[PDB]
Amino acid sequence: QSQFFIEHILQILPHRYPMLLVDRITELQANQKIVAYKNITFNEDVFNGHFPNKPIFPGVLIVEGMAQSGGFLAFTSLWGFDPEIAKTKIVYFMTIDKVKFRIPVTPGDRLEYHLEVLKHKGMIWQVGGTAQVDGKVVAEAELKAMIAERE
Amino acid sequence: SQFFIEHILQILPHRYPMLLVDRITELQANQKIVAYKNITFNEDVFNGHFPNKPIFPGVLIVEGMAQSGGFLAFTSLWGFDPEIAKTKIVYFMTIDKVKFRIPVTPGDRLEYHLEVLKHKGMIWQVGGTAQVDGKVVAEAELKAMIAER
Amino acid sequence: SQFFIEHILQILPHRYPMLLVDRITELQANQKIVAYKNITFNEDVFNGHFPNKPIFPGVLIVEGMAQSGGFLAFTSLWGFDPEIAKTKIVYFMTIDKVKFRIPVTPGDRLEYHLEVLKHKGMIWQVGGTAQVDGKVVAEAELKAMIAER
Amino acid sequence: QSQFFIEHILQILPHRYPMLLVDRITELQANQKIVAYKNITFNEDVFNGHFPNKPIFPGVLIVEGMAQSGGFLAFTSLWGFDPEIAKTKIVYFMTIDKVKFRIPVTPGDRLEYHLEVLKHKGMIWQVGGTAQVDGKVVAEAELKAMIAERE
Amino acid sequence: SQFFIEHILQILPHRYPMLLVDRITELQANQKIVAYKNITFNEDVFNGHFPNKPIFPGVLIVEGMAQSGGFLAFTSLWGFDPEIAKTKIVYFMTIDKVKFRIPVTPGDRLEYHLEVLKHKGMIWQVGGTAQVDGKVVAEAELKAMIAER
Amino acid sequence: QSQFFIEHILQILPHRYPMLLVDRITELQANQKIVAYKNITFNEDVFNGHFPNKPIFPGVLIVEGMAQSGGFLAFTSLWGFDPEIAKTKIVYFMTIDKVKFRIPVTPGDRLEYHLEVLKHKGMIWQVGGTAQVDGKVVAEAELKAMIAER
Ligand SMILES: COc1ccc(C(=O)N/N=C/c2cc(Br)c(O)c(Br)c2O)cc1
Ligand SMILES: COc1ccc(C(=O)N/N=C/c2cc(Br)c(O)c(Br)c2O)cc1
Ligand SMILES: [Cl-]
Ligand SMILES: [Cl-]
Ligand SMILES: [Cl-]
Ligand SMILES: [Cl-]
Ligand SMILES: [Cl-]
Numbered sequence: 001q002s003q004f005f006i007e008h009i010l011q012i013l014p015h016r017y018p019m020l021l022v023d024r025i026t027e028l029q030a031n032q033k034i035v036a037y038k039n040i041t042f043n044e045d046v047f048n049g050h051f052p053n054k055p056i057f058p059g060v061l062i063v064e065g066m067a068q069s070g071g072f073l074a075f076t077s078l079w080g081f082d083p084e085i086a087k088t089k090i091v092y093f094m095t096i097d098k099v100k101f102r103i104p105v106t107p108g109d110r111l112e113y114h115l116e117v118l119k120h121k122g123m124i125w126q127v128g129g130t131a132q133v134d135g136k137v138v139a140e141a142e143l144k145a146m147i148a149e150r151e
Numbered sequence: 152s153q154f155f156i157e158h159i160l161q162i163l164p165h166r167y168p169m170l171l172v173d174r175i176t177e178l179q180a181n182q183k184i185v186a187y188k189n190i191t192f193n194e195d196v197f198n199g200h201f202p203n204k205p206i207f208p209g210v211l212i213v214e215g216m217a218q219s220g221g222f223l224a225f226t227s228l229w230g231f232d233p234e235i236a237k238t239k240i241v242y243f244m245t246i247d248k249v250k251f252r253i254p255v256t257p258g259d260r261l262e263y264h265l266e267v268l269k270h271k272g273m274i275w276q277v278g279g280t281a282q283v284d285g286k287v288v289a290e291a292e293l294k295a296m297i298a299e300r
Numbered sequence: 301s302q303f304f305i306e307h308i309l310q311i312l313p314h315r316y317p318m319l320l321v322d323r324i325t326e327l328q329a330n331q332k333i334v335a336y337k338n339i340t341f342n343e344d345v346f347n348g349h350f351p352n353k354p355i356f357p358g359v360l361i362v363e364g365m366a367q368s369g370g371f372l373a374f375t376s377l378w379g380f381d382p383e384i385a386k387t388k389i390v391y392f393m394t395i396d397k398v399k400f401r402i403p404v405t406p407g408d409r410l411e412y413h414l415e416v417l418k419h420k421g422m423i424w425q426v427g428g429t430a431q432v433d434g435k436v437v438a439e440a441e442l443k444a445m446i447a448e449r
Numbered sequence: 450q451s452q453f454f455i456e457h458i459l460q461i462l463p464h465r466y467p468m469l470l471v472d473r474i475t476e477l478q479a480n481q482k483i484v485a486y487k488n489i490t491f492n493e494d495v496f497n498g499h500f501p502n503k504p505i506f507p508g509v510l511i512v513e514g515m516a517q518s519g520g521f522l523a524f525t526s527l528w529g530f531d532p533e534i535a536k537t538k539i540v541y542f543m544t545i546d547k548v549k550f551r552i553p554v555t556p557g558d559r560l561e562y563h564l565e566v567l568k569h570k571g572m573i574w575q576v577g578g579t580a581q582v583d584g585k586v587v588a589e590a591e592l593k594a595m596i597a598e599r600e
Numbered sequence: 601s602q603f604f605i606e607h608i609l610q611i612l613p614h615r616y617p618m619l620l621v622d623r624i625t626e627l628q629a630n631q632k633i634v635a636y637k638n639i640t641f642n643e644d645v646f647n648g649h650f651p652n653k654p655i656f657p658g659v660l661i662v663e664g665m666a667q668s669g670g671f672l673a674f675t676s677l678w679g680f681d682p683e684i685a686k687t688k689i690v691y692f693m694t695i696d697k698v699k700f701r702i703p704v705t706p707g708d709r710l711e712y713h714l715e716v717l718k719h720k721g722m723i724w725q726v727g728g729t730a731q732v733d734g735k736v737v738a739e740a741e742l743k744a745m746i747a748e749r
Numbered sequence: 750q751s752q753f754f755i756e757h758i759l760q761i762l763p764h765r766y767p768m769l770l771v772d773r774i775t776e777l778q779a780n781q782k783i784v785a786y787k788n789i790t791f792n793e794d795v796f797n798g799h800f801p802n803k804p805i806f807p808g809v810l811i812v813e814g815m816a817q818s819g820g821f822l823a824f825t826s827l828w829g830f831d832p833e834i835a836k837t838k839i840v841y842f843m844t845i846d847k848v849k850f851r852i853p854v855t856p857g858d859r860l861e862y863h864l865e866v867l868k869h870k871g872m873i874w875q876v877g878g879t880a881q882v883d884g885k886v887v888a889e890a891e892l893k894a895m896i897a898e899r
């Protein structure tokens with residue numbers, strides 16, 4: 001109810017490889033906040049192109065990870081932990097604002113997502129927060145996403 | 152004013168599977184740039200976004216816009232110079248005012264329209280839209296920095 | 301008469317990285333089909349064909365025409381029937397008169413134009429060309445047999 | 450200069466993963482013929498999509514393999530094992546005729562290419578032959594290739 | 601006594617890129633198994649092991665032997681039962697006495713020879729060699745456990 | 750001298766994607782021991798097949814990661830951080846012994862390799878140790894390698 005592992009994440013989020021960017025959830029408060037993280041390793045395909053000989057986890061993917069964290073929070077806050085309801089849902093990005101990248105994320109980093117709900121109404125959730133590595137803010141972002149039934 | 156994939160490759164450091172611009176159709180130094188990327192089902196990203204429902208990631212649309220803006224920045228600074236380019240990389244600094252209006256899917260020709268908002272040194276702030284068949288599919292503003300590897 | 305990736309996924313058994321048709325623009329039962337696949341640098345195939353010079357494989361151009369031709373033969377007899385589609389398998393027996401005239405590269409919209417040359421029972425012979433912006437880049441003739449999966 | 454292993458093939462053909470479809474060359478006679486093969490294993494990305502639950506090596510890739518074999522033959526017939534010149538040349542299909550797929554190719558099969566030189570004048574090479582598995586013809590084809598400049 | 605990839609897929613839980621057994625050529629319940637995996641350049645592993653010098657990772661050879669053992673272990677206890685197989689996975693418990701004598705490269709037919717040293721319930725202990733053209737390229741002993749998925 | 754990041758590992762080991770299984774080196778004592786680690790994330794191709802709906806880092810890859818760490822230890826003991834000499838060397842692993850798996854490794858785990866030189870005779874190096882996640886031993890292993898000219 002407050003801590004979830006990759007198996008639980010796979011039953012809630014529709015995202016899959018190579019776009020499931022959340023490995024574990026450490027803190028979860030319904031309608032309120034979520035703390036999760038994704039391990040960053042060299043053994044990830046994106047590193048073949050970003051950049052050759054200089055592995056830098058793409059900033060936009062950090063945003064994606066925060067969004068997915070927000071989505072997990074949004075879903076469980078809505079229907080609780082229900083894989084059956086979740087398997088036919090998808091998530092759409094509506095907006096992204098105030099994104100600032102301060103420190104590059106590289107292989108070996110534990111990218112921690114901290115997101116708080118700024119406002120939600122039905123299926124539309126607007127979250128905002130930071131991504132941290134070893135306690136330091138590596139990025140900050142604000143985004144609004146919509147959960148939608150697969151049509 | 153047409154730059155093809157082999158030209159883009161000589162300027163941008165990005166490579167597979169993060170090189171998201173296939174061709175440059177228009178270029179005007181310190182002003183604007185129009186480019187595009189073809190979207191096909193035969194892209195690994197679609198295996199997971201989403202299964203049975205291919206939607207080109209909104210964040211990758213923004214990445215493509217950033218890269219387009221990057222090409223504009225590189226050439227505006229040093230002209231088409233492969234030698235200088237090979238020592239640089241690019242970092243995302245900020246992203247703002249992005250809105251997605253229509254989902255981009257396999258079969259779409261994703262066209263990037265970026266104009267220079269402000270710039271100085273290696274720091275470039277551009278903004279514009281992403282379009283499919285003449286309709287705005289997304290809006291975005293972003294600031295990136297060019298740097299030595 | 302226009303089918304999108306979602307529809308194609310329901311008729312063809314092909315999946316990544318071998319589903320080479322992104323969208324169907326037109327189709328006349330027992331007569332012809334026009335379909336296409338977008339070519340983008342963001343495709344795994346370009347890693348090896350070739351390094352520093354991306355050229356869409358000619359055999360894959362032919363594979364794309366085949367898939368289009370199969371979609372044609374299938375829908376002509378059964379229409380858009382996902383259920384029946386799973387009970388059937390369209391495989392190719394022969395390929396002839398293949399000619400490559402122009403290389404296909406990232407940024408190109410590879411259009412498949414096939415017409416039914418002849419058909420008898422489950423044996424369907426299709427032929428046509430592959431076009432990029434109105435010009436013929438390849439041509440070929442193929443014969444397929446439709447069988448129970 | 451009748452047997453060549455992957456290290457030698459890599460020095461002659463420009464093809465790389467996932468389009469280098471020749472693993473070894475067992476017989477080679479200048480201007481006359483070549484015998485080579487490609488091992489087929491389930492551990493190949495193509496099988497993820499061709500097809501799910503039913504691994505079948507794409508017929509067009511069988512043709513591609515015959516062509517690469519033919520190209521190696523054409524090049525070495527003209528310049529011998531010359532890696533430096535190989536990287537300045539490239540072979541392209543001009544045409545493909547009389548392709549017949551007789552038996553499906555699947556993981557565990559050793560796809561053996563048998564190409565014979567039907568006609569050659571300068572950079573223009575016409576070859577034809579078969580693809581075999583355990584002595585049986587699984588496919589046949591003819592093709593005309595062009596040895597062109599890389600730049 | 602022989603099983604093809606279609607059969608293996610139905611028994612072992614491994615999938616791409618970790619199903620490293622292609623065909624079973626010999627099987628004696630609770631005693632031994634001979635199988636093999638074709639090695640080809642067209643495998644992703646080779647992109648990193650190593651550039652311009654493809655060598656099939658020694659640890660993957662052991663993995664292949666384990667998988668063969670797992671196939672032996674399961675068919676010995678349930679025969680060819682796809683329904684009960686999909687409810688299990690295999691867990692590596694120990695590895696011992698492995699020696700790598702000859703490098704394995706593209707074009708090689710990696711043959712697995714395993715015999716059960718001991719077995720008790722879901723716990724199976726096998727040992728043997730990996731052969732290429734009749735020569736031992738590797739040796740190993742390992743203990744695995746079949747567990748409820 | 751004691752801390753190496755991915756850029757440094759890339760200049761010493763020949764391994765590349767998808768077989769470079771060491772992300773960072775936290776500590777190194779020439780001729781004695783090495784502590785390093787590889788983050789485990791779901792966004793790795795191997796998890797597509799090991800296993801579907803049940804991601805478990807392959808036990809053999811933990812052993813491979815340990816071997817890589819040993820090789821970096823051996824190499825750096827001999828010539829220190831030297832990319833140029835690194836390109837002319839290779840270390841093949843001859844044997845692997847006494848490996849035991851105690852706890853499965855999964856996405857979200859920080860797989861920490863702990864290797865120590867058990868014996869160094871000529872071109873032969875024997876290393877051994879454990880793989881740990883959050884202080885617990887998840888795997889043990891002994892391995893022998895040989896240093897040779899590329
Ligand atoms: C004569 O060369 C051949 C080429 C392809 C085939 C073939 O069987 N293709 N596809 C077969 C097939 C595909 C799916 Br999907 C499936 O589920 C099943 Br049952 C099939 O037999 C047979 C012969
Ligand atoms: C030309 O690149 C090569 C790299 C490695 C080899 C090889 O067969 N095995 N291993 C090499 C290798 C090198 C380092 Br240094 C190392 O730490 C480890 Br472990 C290795 O396996 C051969 C060729
Ligand atoms: Cl970035
Ligand atoms: Cl999106
Ligand atoms: Cl081609
Ligand atoms: Cl086929
Ligand atoms: Cl090895």
Ligand SMILES: [Cl-]
Pocket residue numbers: 690691692806807808809
């Ligand atoms: Cl395991």
